[PDB]
Every structure is written in C-alpha cells, then in structure tokens.
C-alpha cells in the first residue's frame, strides 16, 4: 500500500562521458571546440566592476550622474557584501560602498530613505529593487565600459555578448536565483521584454539559459525493481482469442476491435510492416507493469488488460477482417510475411476515442485532459518518458540532413546555437490525429524510454540532439591565436541532460495544447453564434493554463492555485485565448489585408504583430502543401507567442524552484552549524546568516518562513545581550502573518 517511486535524483560530476568528439569538420579542416567557463568569467567581470566602482569614487564626480544609478550601485554592493562569506572581501566591498551611502545621505534624503526602507526588509535589497522594468537597465556593464580602460578578454567579451539585457545575469548564484524566484510574485511587474521604437527584445529564454548554466549535472538512479532494470521471463501463456467476424466492432489503424457481452472491447493489434516482435513484447510487459503498480503510482487512467502475445496465420486475419469498410487500407499496414505476430488486450470503449474527439462535451474533455496530464507527469517522475506521444514536425524539407531531423523542439533556443524563437509547426492538426492521449487516459504504452536515456549518449539523444552533444561552432568563435572555436554553448556538453529534461516537459505541454486546439477547431467549425465559439475557446485556454499548473505542482509540489497565480503573472490568458482562436481556425484565410492587420492589432496588444510574406489559400490559411494548415509561415516563427511564453515560464518556474530549494538548504546547513557551536562567530554574523536564510525562502510559502523565524528565536536566545534592531521588522512581519494564519484557520474551522 506504500506509495513512492523507483527512481532517485542525485548529482554527478559531468554528463560528458562517451559523447561525440568536440570537433567541427569543414571542407578539409578539423576545428576543435572549447568551452568558455561561466562562473569564472562572471567572477572576473564582477571584479572588474568593483575596480570600476573604485575608479568612480576616486573621480569624485558623483553629482554628475543620476541618483537612480547610484542607488542601484549601492544596493547591489550591499547585497553582494551580504552574499560574500570571506571577511576580507566583505570588508572591502563595504568600504567601497560607504562613500556612495555618504553622498546619498547628504544630497538625496528621499532616495536615502527609500534605500533604508529596502535595506530593512532583505539582505539582498537589489532583488526587490529590480522587481520591475528597472531590470532592463544594465548599470554594471555601463560602469564597466565607462571606467575600464583596456579591452576585455575573449571569454569576457563572449559573456558580455550573450548576457547583456540585464545586470541580474552577473549576480552570484544565490542572488540570481532569489531574483528569478521573486520575479513571479504578485507585486512584481517584471516581464522579460524590452521595447523601444527601434525593436522589441524578448529574452525569456535567456533567463532559463542563465539559470541552467549555474546548475550541477543531474543523474537519475533506477531501483533494481524498476521496469527497465529487472528481468522478466517470456510471455508464458496459452491464451488464444477466438476471432469471429460476426462481432467485429471495427478496424482502427492496424487494430481489430471486437465486442464482448460485458460491453468492453477486445483489441487485437497486428504486427506492423517493419516492426519486430520485441515491440509487441515490450508493450505487453509495460502494460503488466503499470497495471500491477497502479496503486503505488496512483495512476488515474483506465489501463488496458493484456491477455496474450502470440502468432496467427495471416490468411485467418484476412478472412476475419474482410467485411470491414476499411479492410483495403488495413491490408497495407500489416506485415506482408506469411505469419503475423499479434498482441491482444481488453479495454473500455473510451480507450479508443481520441482526446480531441468532437463528440465529448467540455466537462468530459476537462476530466480526460486532467487525467492524461496527471498520468504523464507522475510517470515522468517515476523514470518513464513517452517521446512519441504525437508526431510533431518543424519541417519535412531536407529532414535527413538537418541536425534535428525535422522533429519539433519545444525549447529550441536552449538546444542550439544562434536560434532565437520557436518555428513553424507543419500540419499541426495532423500531428495529433492519432495522439496517444485517449478519453480513458494514456495508450500505446509500449513506446516509452527510460529517463536515463536523456542524461547519456543513446540512440534517441544522438539521433535527435547531436548539436547539443557535440558543441557549438560559428566562424566568429574561431580564435586564430589558438586554432580553436570557443563558446559558452560547448560548456553545455557537461549538462545536456538538464536541458533535455525541461525539453521533454515542454514537449508534453505542447502536445496537450495541440490536442486542445484540434478539439476546439473541430467543435466550432459548424457553429454560428460567435459568443458560443468564444466561450469554447476561452474554456480551452483555461484548461491549458490549468494543465501547466498541474505540471508545476507534480514536478515541484507547489500548490496548484499558487502555481496558476505564478504562471498568470508571466503569461496573459486573454492573449493566449485570442491567439489560439485566431490562428487555429481557417476564418483568417477569408480576410483582406486591412481586416487581417486590424484584427492582429487586438491579438497582440502592446507588442509587434505577426508578419508573413506568404499567400493564404482560401479555406485553410497558411499551408505549404496547400491542403493542411500550418502554425506559422514558411521559414518564420510560430504565431503563438503566448504559448512560448507560457512554456518557458513553466520550465523556468520548475527549474528555479528546485535551484532555490538547493540554495535554501545550503544556507540552512550553515545556519545549523553556526547555531550549535560548530562555527565560532559573534551575534551579528549569526543574525546575518539567519536573515539570508529568510531571504532564500519560496515566494508565497509560509512554513519556510515559520522555520526561519523559529531559528531566529533560537539564535536570539543564544545571544541575549546583543542588538537586533536591524533584524526586527522582517521577523515581526513573519510572526504577524503566522498569527493571521492561525486565526483564519481557527475561524474557518468554526
């Protein structure tokens, strides 16, 4: 009855074990590829910034620069000094910051008052000071350029070239993680989009990149009782289903559906043209494993019951399935050999209706979608990945010689060098035509991989993600002084599994989105009342946001309502509604240019519109083949901008929450050691440590702050004869919130 997972998460030294050698082969030259270290380069740039601050102070012309910049510099210096642990460096940073504080107090009393108010709330006041569009201004880089009178090294130049939209990209790990976590707060108005009259810069993916480059390599250990670890005997049984065409319900793909007196369905899945018997055996075994561990894993879908796996004469199959109206086409799919292998199971009828079937109502669709999402993500936590839920392609033109092989990549910006946004989805509706998400729940369970196939070289990752595993090359990366091409991207060879994990999560969510869009498109096609169509599409958008919140909750454990609030901070549900309704229906194909542009104005409010120099085919819209609609013009980006923002927000929330928890426990260990006498330091240092631990708490989470308050009380008890006027407002606020929670709970109970 125990509920737990057969997979454990830990950390390794590097994912770079048996990868392709880091070499680019040109016409006849071999160019070695080299990594630019991230942490060392960032530290070098921070030290340069400190020297520039010293130069500024020596130049003693602070009255000539805006007070906002001085406040930014002072707050960052205070936060960096608090982060730094070495006594000498901390003292140097504080001495370097003192003159700015003196000048501000003397000449800007109100700015000084605001700065002090921020200081009393946090050990890293810079992160709260940058909870808005002020994060779009890179004061660190500006000062570095102003006062650094010598060229930056190649590594520093590359780092500056990559991370330049904000100065938060130069923060040390705890400060950057805290800022990223808090940027999703309700009081936060930050959104990663810098708009000017010239152009608009979306850099949401840069936050995820800067976060991922700071993480340790991850590893997943599968227990000896896992499906992919333990060995199982052959399929021992003598079952032989009796096929009678007088009760043949229908033919679905390469499967024969017969009826039963019990109202269930018997499905006979016949061997495919090129597939081996091992595929059917694996499907059988996976079905048994899931049916056995259903209670342990708490899977809500209706799993099929497998009955047997054996061989039948082809002539018999042809005889039984002769009367079906799809017999001719079903003939081609099956193997042409004399003898055919089969896999037989029993399932309810809803197991064969697809999740986008129009005959469902919105409530049933919502329930089925919730079931499918929950099952997918719990099985992901258990170490099983379904890379073939749907067959989604970015393009088919020259797919063989493409690095991606034409497979759509959810987080394209992260897995490639010099890719800036998601691309077109070819024949989007046909991608989820036979999706493995069914009304009952999951299906086609034999097409799964172990999660360890993402963190190591394997057929799947080598086939689809060779660019990530090999290293990035561009002529501008080539340094003639060494004969090597250096890039920050090559460093990802050490951590590619971390990227592929989030890519899989985003791919699941994208498949869900495409299925919902297909349902909405089919349902509203023959409707006439525009309000009814709008209501359908709005409900579908709500379902999508709820699915993303469920993914976050299952991955991190955040409450679903809070996860939805955090997502809504970053992604706009109204815009997603509008964009999905517009681009996923053929109506836009029957408009002239003026009306199309006028509608797009409302579709993308406060942002540039979607431009395409393509010809719309009447009745379909954007399509390269002319019969099947696409999502995006040829060689352009996908028009669903809010969907990309939502996917990136989801993956960023999950990864950043894990990283923030890691930082929080790292600081908690130091606090505990200090508070038990293991480390000898005065009262001020202990209170500083506890305040930092408080600043490393989850946004919107209270029990963490309760624990920190208890540790603060214990520390204050250990140092009764010490001043705490600095660390009193914040803990008083925490205590008041605790009391409010207690009162609310007691009242609502009665």
């Amino acid at each position: 009855v125990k509920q737990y997972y057969f997979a454990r998460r830990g950390e390794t030294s590097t994912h770079d074990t048996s990868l392709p050698p880091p070499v680019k082969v040109l016409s006849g030259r071999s160019i070695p590829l080299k990594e630019i270290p991230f942490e060392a380069t960032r530290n070098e740039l921070v030290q340069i910034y400190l020297t520039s601050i010293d130069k500024l102070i020596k130049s003693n012309k602070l009255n000539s620069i805006p007070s906002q910049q001085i406040a930014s510099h002072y707050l960052f210096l205070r936060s960096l000094a608090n982060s730094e642990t070495d006594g000498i460096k901390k003292n140097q940073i504080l001495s370097l910051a003192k003159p700015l504080g003196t000048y501000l107090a003397s000449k800007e009393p109100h700015v000084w008052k605001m700065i002090n108010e921020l200081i009393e709330k946090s050990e890293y006041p810079i992160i709260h000071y940058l909870k808005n569009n002020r994060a779009h201004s890179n004061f660190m880089l500006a000062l570095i350029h102003e006062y650094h009178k010598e060229p930056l090294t190649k590594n520093q130049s590359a780092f500056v070239q990559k991370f330049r939209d904000s100065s938060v990209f130069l923060f040390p790990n705890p400060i950057y993680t805290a800022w990223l976590a808090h940027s999703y707060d309700e009081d936060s108005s930050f959104n990663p989009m810098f708009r000017e009259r010239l152009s608009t810069n979306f850099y949401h993916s840069t936050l995820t990149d800067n976060l991922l480059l700071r993480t340790e390599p991850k590893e997943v250990t599968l227990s000896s009782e896992h499906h992919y670890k333990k060995e199982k005997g052959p399929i021992d049984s003598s079952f032989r289903y009796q096929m009678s065409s007088d009760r043949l319900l229908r033919i679905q793909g390469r499967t024969l559906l017969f009826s039963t007196p019990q109202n269930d369905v018997v499905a006979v899945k016949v061997q495919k043209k090129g597939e081996p018997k091992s595929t059917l055996e694996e499907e059988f075994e996976m079905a048994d494993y899931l049916l056995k561990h259903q209670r342990r894993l708490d899977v809500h879908s209706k799993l099929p019951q497998p009955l047997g796996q054996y061989s039948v004469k082809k002539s018999e199959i042809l005889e039984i399935s002769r009367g079906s109206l799809d017999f001719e086409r079903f003939k081609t799919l099956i193997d042409d050999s004399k003898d055919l292998e089969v896999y037989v199971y029993k399932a309810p009828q809803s197991y064969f209706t697809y999740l986008h079937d129009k005959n469902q109502d919105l409530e049933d669709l919502t329930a089925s979608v919730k079931t499918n999402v929950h099952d997918l993500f719990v099985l992901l936590r258990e170490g099983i990945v379904f890379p073939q839920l749907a067959d989604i392609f970015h393009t088919h033109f020259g797919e063989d010689e493409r690095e991606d092989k034409g497979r759509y990549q959810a987080l394209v910006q992260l897995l490639n060098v010099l890719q800036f946004q998601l691309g077109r989805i070819d024949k989007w509706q046909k991608a989820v035509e036979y999706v493995n998400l069914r009304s009952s729940g999951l299906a086609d369970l034999g097409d799964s991989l172990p999660i360890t196939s993402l963190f190591t070289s394997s057929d799947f990752t080598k086939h689809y993600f060779s660019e990530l595993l090999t290293g990035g090359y561009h002529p501008t990366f080539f340094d003639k002084s060494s004969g090597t091409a250096n890039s920050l991207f090559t460093g990802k060879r050490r951590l590619f599994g971390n990227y592929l994990y989030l890519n899989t999560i985003a791919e699941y969510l994208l498949v869900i989105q495409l299925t919902l869009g297909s349902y909405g498109d089919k349902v509203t096609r023959d409707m006439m009342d525009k309000p009814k169509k709008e209501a359908v599409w709005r409900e579908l958008a709500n379902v999508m946001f709820t699915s993303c919140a469920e993914a976050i909750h299952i991955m991190t454990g955040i409450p679903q309502s809070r996860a939805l609030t955090l997502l809504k901070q970053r992604a706009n549900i109204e815009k997603h509604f509008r964009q999905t309704q517009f681009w996923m229906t053929p109506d836009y194909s029957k408009l002239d240019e003026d009306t199309l542009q006028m509608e797009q104005y409302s579709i993308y409010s406060g942002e540039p519109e979607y431009e395409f120099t393509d010809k719309l085919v009447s009745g379909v819209g954007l399509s390269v083949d002319g019969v099947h609609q696409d999502l995006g013009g040829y060689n352009r980006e996908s028009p669903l901008r809010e969907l990309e923002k939502l996917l990136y927000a989801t993956v960023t929330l999950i990864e950043g929450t894990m990283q923030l928890d890691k930082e929080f426990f790292k600081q908690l260990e130091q606090v505990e050691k200090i508070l038990s006498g293991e480390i000898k330091t005065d009262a001020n240092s202990c209170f500083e440590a506890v305040a930092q631990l408080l600043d490393l708490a989850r946004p919107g989470c209270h029990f963490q702050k309760r624990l920190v308050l208890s540790y603060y009380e214990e520390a204050k008890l250990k140092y009764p004869s010490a001043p705490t006027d600095a660390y009193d407002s914040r803990f008083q606020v925490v205590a008041r919130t605790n009391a409010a929670i207690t009162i609310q709970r007691f009242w609502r109970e009665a």
Binding site: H110, V111, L152, Q161, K162, Y601, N635
Partner: protein, 724 residues
C-alpha cells in the same frame, strides 16, 4: 536619436491607462451637452475630451519636438525662452515628463461647460488628479522620471494653469498648444482658427515645421476616425478673431477701422481677412484650399466610417489608439520621400543592356579559356585588357543582369579556371591574416564535398564560399566597392568573374520570398561614423510632410547631393532578418536597417550552412533613403552603436548616368580582329564592310573553306546576340 518614444514607452502608457480607467473612461457627472454617445453599439462617454483627445495631444507634443529638432538641423533660427533654450533643446526625459503631465490635462473635467469658473474648477481637479497619481506611484517615479517633489509641483502648477501663461517654458508651450490645436476639427470657422494656431506655433519652430505638424495632424485625425475639416481661402463667412470674439469691420470708405452694429458697415469676411498684406505675407495658407473628408470615398462611406465600432475601440482602448497613431506616424515618415521623386513603373530588374551583353560574353570566354590570363593582363585574341577594364566593369555593370545572362556552363568552367589559377588572395581587412591560395582551396573543397559534379551542388558551394571564408569575401567586397588598397590584378579578375556567377547561383538556388526588413552590420571608425551621421541628418532634416507649400525640390536636391546608398551596392551584400544575430556574432558598431515593403530589393535567401541570412545586390534604380538614426547602446568593446533606418525607394531619378561602350568597343575590336585574321588567312566584301566600321556599335550591327565559314558564323552569332 534615442530609444524613448510615446508609442513604445511603458511608463507613459501606464499613466494613460490609469487616467482612462479612473477619469476619462467614466460618464460625465453633470449636464452640459454631456450625454454618452453610441458608436457601433459601444458607449463612448466623453467623445470630445476622452482618451483619443489626450493621446492625440501627447502625439502632437512629440511631433512638435521632432519637427523643431529637424528645423534646427536645417539651419533655421527658433524662438528663445527666458534663457537661451529653444524647443529643439527638449531632451527625451523632459518630453517624458511633459507627456505624463499631458495625460492628466482634461482628467478633472465634469462637463463641456466653457465658462471661466468651470474652467478653473476643472483644471484644479485635473491638477489634484495628477498629484494623486504621482503620489500613488512615487515608488517608481519620484526618483526615476521626476527629479524630486519640486519638479512634480512644477508640472502640477503647469497643469493648474492658474495664470494664462503659455510661453514661460517649453512645457507650457507644448501642453497648451497641443491641447488648443487638437480642436481645429470642431471649431465651426476653420480658416480663422487654423490661421491663429499656425501663427502661434510658427514663432517657436518655423513655417516649414508648422506645416509638417499640421499636415501630420490630419493623418492622426484620419487614423482615429475623427472628421477632418477642409480649408477654403475663398470663404464668405464673416471672419472671427480667435482672441476674444471682436470681429473686424470696414469703415464707410471701405478700409478696416484701426457689437458695433454700424449702419453702413459690414463684418469683414474670411477671404478678405486672408488677403490682408500682413497675413498673406506670413501665412502660407493664403489663397490655397484643402479638400475635407477622406479622399477617394463618397459622403455615405465616410459617414459609415466615422460611425463604426472602430471609433469606440479608439476611444476605449489605449493600446489600440496608440497603435493607430504609431502606424500613421510611420506612414507619414515614409510618404514625403516617395513624394519627392518620380514614380517607378514596376518592381523588376531591367532587361540586359548592350554594354552588359558584351561583358557577359567576355566573362564567358575568359572562363572557357583560362589560358588567356597572363601575369597582369588579358590578351584575348588581339585585345589587351588590364586591371582598369575589370574595375570599370565592376563599377558600371549591374552584375545581377549580367549573371542572368550566364548559363550553367560557366558554373562548370569555374573548376577549369580555378585549376588554371592556383594563385593567392589577401584579406582586405586585417592584413596580418595568413593569406591562402584560392585555386587549391576550391579544388580541395570540390573534391571532398562534390565528387559527382552536379551543378546545383557547385552553386551551393559557391554561395557558401561567398557567405563564409573572410579571406575571400572581404577582398571581393573591397574590390567591388572600390575600397581596396594594394590589390593584385589576379584578385580583381577573380572578383569581377565571381560576382555575376554568385548572383546567378543565388537566383537559381533561392526559393523564399523577399523579406520586408533586413539588417547589415558594418565596422567603422569614429570619424567616418560622424561623417555618416552628418549625411543622414542632412537627409532627414529636409524631409517633411506638406500642408500648403511644396518642399519636394529641396529634399530631392539634398538626397541627390548627399546619397548614402553608394556604400551598400555594387556587391553581394550579406544581410539578416534578425538583428539579434548581428548583435550576437559580429557586434558591429554600425547597423544599416533596410525596409523593403514593396519588395524592390529582390533579396535572395542563402541556403542553410544561416537560415535567416539573405544576399542583396542593390539595383541601380533603387536608392536607400534614411528615415532615422538611433544611438542603440554600446558594443562589447564599449563603442557607441548607431542604427540607420533606410527605406528602399525606386525611381528613374536614381539611375546612374554612365557612358556606354566601356565594354562594347573592346568587343567589336575583338570580332574585327578575328575577322581580319580569318580573311588574311584566306588571302570577300564582308571583310572590308565589317572592318570599315570602327568602334560604332550601332553602325556595326547595321553592317552585321568550311572552317572559315564556321568563323563567320561565330562572329555573326555574336553580333545577333549583341543586337538582341
């Protein structure tokens, strides 16, 4: 130029949204012609002092500032304030403060009453609303946009308008004149109010800038679905004196006196008023007419347009109205440029010219017979062609059409020529860059990558070589643009041979349609950058929209006398649709942004190697006319980055005027020598008939044992190719 703009800045938009949500998007709390109106089924509560009016006033302020900057940059003298500052000296921060104040000017109104007491009450309420908004958001304004509370108080006092002070500071002038000029649409006598406002604004910026402002105001009205009133100099309505109401009257004799209900006198009319010497010598609108309404539609269509759901959207959605105004402003920026030049017939490259068919044939023979190349010259069956001949070919032939004249046999003969040459080429930039041999490189590349020898793979490899291998394209571009220093004759010959071939390969292998916006990166020194900025400012300052006067000749002269597109053409320039790529790979300190809404650039995509990269060979009939120059941050070295925005405009006025025969006379000499050789071998009238015509292509085409016959057949075919 700067990043800040009304249409993209977020704090101004937030201020406008707050004003609309709290004050402007609410029903009037009184009864003076204050009944909400219906437009397309949606309610507009304040149709005269609503959101559209405030957004239009803010747009007017920004437009006035930009026109003043242009006028100063034209060398005109502008009105001064109590200190030496003029309107053109207003900085982006001051403009932001002025616009945030302007967003609250009419917030405090409760009715449409126009009496003094109600005026003062409403302005007091507006001042209170502005102060409350600033106080509520002081956590992000008082340190950032406003210097301190004293500056906020200054702007609040401007909003209060206690004393009718409309000239003390730039803020007073901008706010008051924007608010006043927005009402030209409604005032029943249009000519008098237009003259008054033109005179009031002309003393601060000038006549040309005022005309531009009032010309763009009409476009703003059209974009916001507001009626546009016509201007009629020959109007018989009595003239109205805007200051107060005192009408002008003429004495009994007939002249003006320098209600009266005088017995034998009548009120002066508008037409008479506009004829006065003191007015017609300063008002450009005297004796001129403006057609009212939207041109190209009847009265019924116009009435339907003005009464539509779009009017309600403009009056109720801040972002929608801002986008409408932004689009109108961009169109008004582009329109005068096209107005100043003749109209292009089509959008296709012209047919081959006689001077270019000969060049194509010469290139064909050079490729087919690599042995014809010597140390530094080309001895082609009689004629010695030197470096300057090929330089003139590069500088005077449109190599796109020349490449269109070539066939796949040239792509094949590339291998023969490269095998013959095996010479060396040098980096144009960064001389200390380890030169390389070109023939060996091409042979090795073809041997390792294209063993089958198919033509399409050869075209792709040539395009790749042009797109990469700095050692090749740096020299080729430098030679093509005549910027090369110390170039060998072999390098010049290779450049002139490869350019049309690369164009032909790009045309053949390209499949995507031309994008409407492209970016190119250039690495330039500070002095050259300053020269370029001066040239671009000269372009921009003289381009204004017209109301009455026609200023097209000045803009045409300045653009023709200062064209900056010379440093873009003559080569297969590489561009990209994504500026992020430019800022991420090369980080150039200068960036050229080309807009091609019409598709005049014939941009060809470069195969994947790079999916966003295109190649442009600027047509001789197309000019790149700048529309703005912006300072956009700094490069990774810390140098200023400048972005020049150009608009591609095609007109015959930009067609270069070259002298023909630069490539044909050597050609006709070639066939003349060939005929003389064959006939000297022979030794009959054809020889003297063809020889007698010397270096006169038209005369030659008038004029024009088996091996000899083949020779004359070849010469004939050459001549009929030239004539065709």
């Amino acid at each position: 130029g700067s990043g800040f703009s009304l249409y993209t800045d977020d704090t101004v938009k937030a201020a406008a949204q707050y004003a609309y949500d709290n004050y402007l998007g609410k029903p009037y709390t009184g009864s003076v012609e204050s009944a909400p109106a219906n437009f397309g089924g949606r309610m507009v509560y304040r149709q005269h002092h609503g959101l559209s009016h405030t957004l239009r006033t803010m747009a007017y302020a920004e437009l006035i500032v930009e026109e003043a900057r242009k006028a100063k940059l034209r060398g005109e003298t502008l009105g001064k304030f109590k200190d030496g500052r003029t309107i053109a000296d207003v900085t982006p921060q001051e403009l932001k403060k002025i616009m945030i104040a302007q967003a609250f000017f009419v917030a405090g109104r409760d009715d449409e009453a126009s009496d003094a007491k109600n005026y003062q009450k409403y302005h007091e309420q507006s001042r209170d609303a502005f102060l409350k908004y600033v106080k509520d958001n002081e956590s992000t304004l008082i340190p950032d946009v406003f210097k301190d509370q004293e500056d906020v108080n200054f702007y609040a006092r401007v909003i209060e308008d206690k004393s009718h002070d409309w000239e003390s500071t730039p803020a007073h002038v901008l706010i008051n004149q924007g608010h006043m000029v927005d009402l030209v649409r409604v005032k029943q006598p249009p000519e008098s109010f237009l003259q008054r406002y033109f005179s009031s604004m002309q003393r601060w910026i000038g006549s040309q800038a005022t005309e531009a402002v009032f010309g763009i105001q009409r476009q703003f009205f059209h974009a916001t679905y507001e009626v546009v009133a016509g201007f009629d100099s020959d109007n018989k309505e009595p003239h109205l004196v805007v200051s107060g109401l005192g009408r002008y009257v003429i004495g009994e004799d007939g002249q003006p006196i320098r209600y009266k209900l005088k017995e034998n006198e009548r009120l002066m009319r508008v037409d008479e008023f506009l004829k006065l010497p003191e007015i017609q010598n300063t008002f450009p609108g005297s004796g001129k007419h403006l057609q009212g309404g939207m041109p190209g539609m009847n009265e019924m269509d116009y009435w339907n347009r003005l009464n539509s759901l779009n009017r309600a959207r403009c009056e109720n959605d801040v972002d929608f109205c801002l986008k409408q105004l932004q689009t109108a402003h961009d169109k008004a920026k582009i329109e005068p440029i096209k107005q100043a030049f003749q109209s292009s017939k089509g959008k296709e490259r012209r047919q081959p010219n006689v001077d270019e068919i000969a060049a194509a044939r010469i290139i064909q023979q050079i490729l087919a017979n690599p042995d014809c190349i010597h140390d530094d010259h080309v001895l082609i069956n009689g004629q010695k062609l030197e470096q300057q001949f090929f330089r003139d070919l590069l500088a005077k032939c449109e190599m796109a059409v020349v490449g269109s004249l070539l066939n796949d046999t040239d792509i094949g003969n590339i291998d023969t020529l490269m095998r013959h040459e095996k010479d060396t080429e040098f980096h144009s930039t960064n001389p200390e860059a380890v030169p390389v041999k070109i023939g060996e490189y091409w042979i090795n590349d073809q041997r390792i990558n294209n063993s089958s020898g198919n033509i399409t793979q050869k075209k792709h490899d040539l395009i790749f070589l042009m797109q990469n291998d700095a050692w090749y394209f740096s020299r080729v571009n430098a030679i093509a643009q005549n910027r090369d220093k110390g170039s060998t004759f072999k390098e010049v010959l290779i450049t002139t041979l490869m350019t049309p071939l690369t164009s032909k390969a790009l045309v053949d292998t390209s499949q995507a349609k031309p994008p409407t916006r492209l970016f190119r990166g250039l690495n330039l020194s500070e002095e050259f950058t300053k020269g370029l900025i001066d040239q671009a400012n000269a372009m921009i300052a003289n381009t204004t929209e017209r109301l009455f006067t026609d200023h097209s000749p000045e803009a045409f002269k300045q653009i023709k006398l200062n064209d900056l597109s010379k440093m873009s053409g003559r080569t297969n320039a590489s561009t990209t649709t994504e500026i992020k790529l430019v800022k991420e790979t090369w980080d150039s300190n200068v960036i050229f942004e080309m807009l091609d809404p019409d598709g005049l650039l014939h941009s060809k995509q470069v195969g994947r190697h790079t999916e966003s990269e295109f190649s442009v060979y600027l047509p001789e009939d197309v000019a790149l006319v700048p529309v703005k120059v912006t300072l956009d941050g700094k490069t990774q070295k810390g140098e200023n980055r400048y972005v020049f925005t150009f608009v591609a405009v095609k007109s015959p006025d930009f067609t270069p005027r070259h002298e023909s025969g630069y490539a044909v006379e050597p050609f006709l000499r070639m066939q003349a020598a060939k005929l003389a050789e064959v006939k000297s071998s022979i030794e009959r009238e054809l020889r003297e008939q063809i020889q007698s015509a010397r270096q006169e292509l038209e005369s030659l085409q008038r004029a024009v044992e088996r091996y000899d016959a083949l020779i004359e057949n070849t010469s004939k075919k050459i001549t009929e190719l030239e004539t065709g």
